[PDB]
């Protein structure tokens, strides 16, 4: 009746136990229902196939603005925060995004309240209020959102490409919008934005352009009736789907060179080729076949040779989405100092590789290898988190038939050499666009992009250059990839051992290593997680050694890259990085060949031979990387400073780059043996693996280090952990700095409570749960201080507390007063809330903390967190939630009155103020809720001095976990 059709069988992975049913309502809405009787959280998402590409020419950002407004009230639920408040009280969350052709809304919530959430949600598409008052406030949120992107290099380049194509093509539009485009200019032009928002919603939010996906515990039949009851009423305007057959880049936009000045000190080369829309060929993906080859990093690849010449370090190639009717094919690389001088040669090599592909012709075995790999990946796919899953599905329901939505973007079908040749025929010099990003162009540009202010220059590429590229011949160093030897073949799930444990067990406890093990007893997929922490005091003893630890590992990954790329493609991955206590190594994926890769890594780090050239290149990139932190956002600087302030030992970026210039090859080579001579290893092996196999992996790691590095055990007294500074009662310190790039302020306020413990943890978490929603609605929605407004707990070195983070055009001291006013408002709010409401929050937190991992790596991460923090409280959630339910409203009031209130006897407050670029100075104190009077803070002028003048907290005691 209200249903036009019900899908046949929804092809899913055999390992997938969830149930699916696809349907199309009478109004044209495509739906995918998902029943998962085990899910702790239910979720829904609706994707409207309309985006910024459809913004009216005179109101840039209208669709994005519409997106923001839909969260602030509907005819059925007028309360501007009814939606967010409801979700918050029921362990839910929500967000939405706007792209060129889509506006996607989504939320998740306790499985028991799917109906209530979905009802409030459906109203976004039935009776939005677009309240005048909300409109005038929320426009500030949009402006602030754009403001933080202004000095972001990725966004600047994004808009620059649009501004350099056909000006008449909608691809040229500014999609974010700001106060000028959404308020100032419209007012001047006599345009009523409120009307336009309604007109836009009325004209494009049509049921025929919508797709919905719902996931819950309810049966498919019940979910079917629920969806019909709430969405069949959406009106169908029979809106035509926007199409863009003419490519934004026409002839006059090809064979062009762009020289661009970046904000950060980065060096990049972007090569772009216009191509037809390849979306309809998804069954064979000719564009991805070419991306796979051109972007390959194995021996014989384009990258391998460009790196050998010392011209580039990284490369990305393949097709890039555009919109219905047009796409792009790119080849992007970063540049070394030398690579910057050889851009013409680099591009020549690009065409030589492309010519090599043309000469050999399409390779079916390559396609087949990927097809089979994709089949394996789809079959053993990890179970997704509901929210992201529904959002993703709502989006692709627009491109594939109901029955194929789950497989469409995973499985390959037919090899189409003709389509591959057709795309390859478009990758030629005559149709190339080249952009070079480098500080070396500063003062050499003559154009400015209006929306971001990007400085650049445009030149036609000389015909003789085009002609030399067209004559690209074959380069003996370029070869097609060899057969991938890492493809997994053994997928058997070993039977659960009789002595298997529900939590990780300590099966090895020696001075050289401590091994935690757990055989997967929930997911049963042929995968495993091998986590290793290598302790050594020489990884962070001083700035120079921190630099060497980083450089060492970076050089190792770089030398293993060719080898490891193939493994990565075969679903075998690894992460290796230096830490403040040593090194971290993690190998994840199919268990089959993990031992081979792991052995190779350990063997290599212990017998590593540094390439001088690679060493100099990576050192130079690292130097810029440290310097580039100055271009990060204000709130990031704020977080950075707080971290340096509150931790016993922490080397600053400045100390690191100062010590860097003295890292020499000889010094680095001497460093490695020292680093590996003495270590302690704590590991967590979790997955499709046996106790005896675990012991075997650990022994192999030990034996390899002992054999090549002569590694010996470390002394237990050497296993030092850092402490957090202990603030004095009623103390308040302020550290102030300035961000030289962004013209916006940032701030982080930290109210230190006490050492982590069951009671203290839940006191803090319950309070945060309670203020979470009100904090966002007050400081952002109501007061519009900025797009970024955050509150929540802060945990570090066993200590904890409450933190607020804000980025705004308003000065820090004003921001501080607002947070303080809000605290008092939350005070009255809590004292006035009903036991009913209070218990909702307890239950909300309970569900949040008990929501269980849906994939192996998520469960492992939780165990790893306990091991890394050395608290080893694996049954933490049950414990803490049991305690949580004990908490009363009064306990919270007392906790607030003793630790957080402005006149609390145990208030421990530190504030980091980051001033905007255009602020030469600023004080540190100064129809809105009334802000309380604040004490005079002690200004921190030197971080070292600050820490020295305060005591340090002790380290948290470990939760004893008995085992051999």
């Amino acid at each position: 009746p209200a249903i036009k059709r019900i899908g046949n069988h929804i092809t899913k992975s055999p390992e997938d136990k969830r149930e699916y049913r696809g349907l199309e309502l009478a109004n044209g809405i495509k739906v995918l229902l998902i029943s998962d009787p085990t899910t702790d959280k239910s979720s829904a998402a609706l994707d409207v196939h309309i985006g910024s590409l459809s913004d009216p020419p005179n109101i840039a950002g209208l669709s994005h603005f519409c997106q923001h407004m839909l969260f602030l009230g509907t005819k059925k639920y007028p309360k501007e925060n009814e939606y967010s408040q409801f979700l918050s009280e029921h362990a839910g969350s929500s967000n939405a995004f706007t792209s060129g052709e889509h506006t996607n809304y989504y939320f998740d919530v306790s499985h028991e309240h799917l109906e209530g959430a979905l009802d409030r949600f459906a109203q976004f598409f039935l009776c939005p209020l677009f309240d005048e008052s909300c409109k005038d406030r929320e426009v500030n949120a949009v402006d602030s959102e754009h403001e933080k992107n202004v000095m972001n290099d990725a966004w600047r380049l994004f808009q620059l490409e649009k501004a350099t194509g056909n000006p008449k093509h909608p691809f040229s539009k500014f999609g974010t919008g700001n106060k000028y485009t959404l308020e100032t200019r419209p007012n001047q032009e006599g345009i009523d934005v409120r009307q336009e928002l309604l007109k836009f919603h009325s004209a494009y939010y049509s049921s025929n352009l919508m797709a919905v996906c719902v996931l819950g515990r309810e049966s498919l039949d019940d979910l079917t009736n629920l969806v019909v009851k709430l969405f069949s009423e959406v009106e169908n305007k029979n809106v035509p789907l926007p199409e863009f057959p003419e490519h934004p880049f026409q002839e006059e936009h090809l064979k062009q060179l762009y020289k661009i000045v970046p904000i950060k000190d980065i060096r990049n080369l972007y090569v772009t080729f216009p191509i037809p829309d390849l979306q309809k060929y998804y069954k064979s993906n000719p564009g991805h076949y070419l991306g796979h080859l051109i972007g390959h990093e194995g021996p014989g690849s384009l990258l391998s040779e460009l790196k050998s010449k010392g011209w580039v370090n990284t490369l990305v190639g393949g097709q890039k989405e555009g919109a219905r009717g047009f796409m792009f094919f790119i080849i992007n690389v970063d540049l070394t100092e030398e690579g910057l001088l050889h851009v013409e040669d680099i591009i020549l090599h690009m065409f030589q590789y492309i010519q090599k592909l043309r000469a050999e012709g399409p390779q079916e075995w390559v396609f087949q290898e990927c097809k089979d790999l994709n089949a394996v990946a789809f079959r053993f796919k990890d179970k997704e988190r509901p929210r992201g899953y529904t959002s993703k599905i709502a989006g692709i329901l627009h491109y594939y038939p109901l029955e194929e939505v789950l497989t469409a973007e995973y499985l390959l079908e037919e090899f189409r050499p003709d389509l591959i040749e057709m795309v390859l025929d478009k990758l030629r010099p005559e149709n190339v666009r080249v952009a070079i990003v480098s500080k070396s162009f500063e003062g050499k540009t003559d154009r400015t992009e209006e929306w971001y202010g990007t400085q650049y220059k445009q030149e036609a590429i000389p015909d003789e250059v085009i002609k030399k590229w067209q004559n690209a011949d074959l380069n003996g160093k370029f070869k097609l990839p060899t057969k991938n030897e890492f493809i997994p073949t053994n997928f058997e799930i070993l039977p659960l051992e009789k002595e298997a444990t529900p939590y990780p067990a300590l099966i090895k406890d020696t001075a050289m290593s401590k091994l935690w093990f757990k055989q997967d007893d929930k997911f049963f997929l042929p995968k495993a997680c091998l986590n290793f922490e290598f302790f050594s005091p020489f990884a962070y003893v001083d700035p120079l050694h921190c630099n060497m630890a980083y450089l060492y590992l970076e050089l190792l990954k770089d030398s293993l890259n060719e080898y490891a790329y193939a493994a990565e493609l075969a679903g075998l991955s690894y992460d290796l990085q230096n830490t403040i206590y040593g090194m971290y190594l993690s190998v994840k994926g199919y268990n089959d060949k993990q031992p081979i890769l792991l052995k190779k890594i350990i063997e290599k780090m212990a017998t590593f031979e540094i390439d001088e050239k690679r060493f100099e290149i990576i050192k130079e990139a690292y130097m810029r990387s440290l310097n580039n932190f100055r271009a990060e956002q204000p709130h990031q600087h704020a977080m950075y400073y707080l971290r340096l302030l509150m931790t016993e030992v922490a080397w600053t970026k400045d100390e690191l780059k100062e010590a860097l210039d003295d890292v020499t090859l000889p010094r680095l080579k001497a460093f490695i043996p020292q680093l590996l001579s003495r270590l302690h290893i704590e590991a967590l092996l979790h997955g499709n693996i046996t106790k005896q196999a675990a012991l075997g992996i650990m022994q192999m790691v030990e034996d390899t280090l002992i054999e090549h590095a002569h590694t010996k055990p470390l002394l237990p007294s050497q296993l030092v952990r850092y402490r957090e500074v202990q603030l004095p009662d009623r103390g308040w310190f302020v550290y102030q700095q300035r961000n030289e790039v962004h013209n916006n302020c940032g701030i982080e306020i930290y109210y230190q409570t006490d050492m982590q413990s069951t009671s203290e943890n839940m006191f803090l978490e319950l309070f945060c749960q309670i203020i979470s929603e009100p904090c966002f609605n007050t400081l952002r929605t109501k007061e519009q201080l900025g797009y970024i407004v955050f509150s929540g707990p802060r945990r570090a070195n066993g200590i904890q507390g409450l933190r607020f983070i804000i980025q705004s055009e308003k000065p820090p001291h004003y921001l501080e007063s607002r947070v303080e006013a809000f605290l008092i408002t939350m005070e009255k709010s809590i004292e006035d809330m009903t036991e009913e409401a209070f218990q909702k929050h307890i239950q909300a937190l309970a569900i949040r903390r008990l929501d269980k991992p849906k994939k192996l790596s998520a469960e492992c991460a939780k165990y790893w967190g306990e091991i890394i923090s050395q608290q080893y409280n694996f049954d933490r959630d049950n414990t803490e939630v049991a305690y949580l339910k004990t908490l009363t409203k009064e306990d919270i009031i007392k906790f607030y009155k003793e630790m957080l209130a402005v006149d609390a006897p145990r208030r421990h407050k530190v504030s980091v103020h980051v001033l905007a670029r255009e602020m030469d100075s600023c004080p540190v104190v100064g129809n809105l809720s009334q802000a309380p009077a604040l004490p005079q803070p002690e200004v921190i002028q030197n971080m070292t001095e600050f820490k020295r003048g305060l005591p340090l907290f002790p380290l948290v005691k470990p939760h004893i976990n008995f085992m051999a």
Binding site: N95, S99, H296, V316, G317, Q319
Partner: peptide
């Protein structure tokens, strides 16, 4: 290897 969205809130 082988190969911008505006949100309501930064997550």
């Amino acid at each position: 290897d082988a190969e911008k969205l505006v949100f309501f809130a930064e997550d």
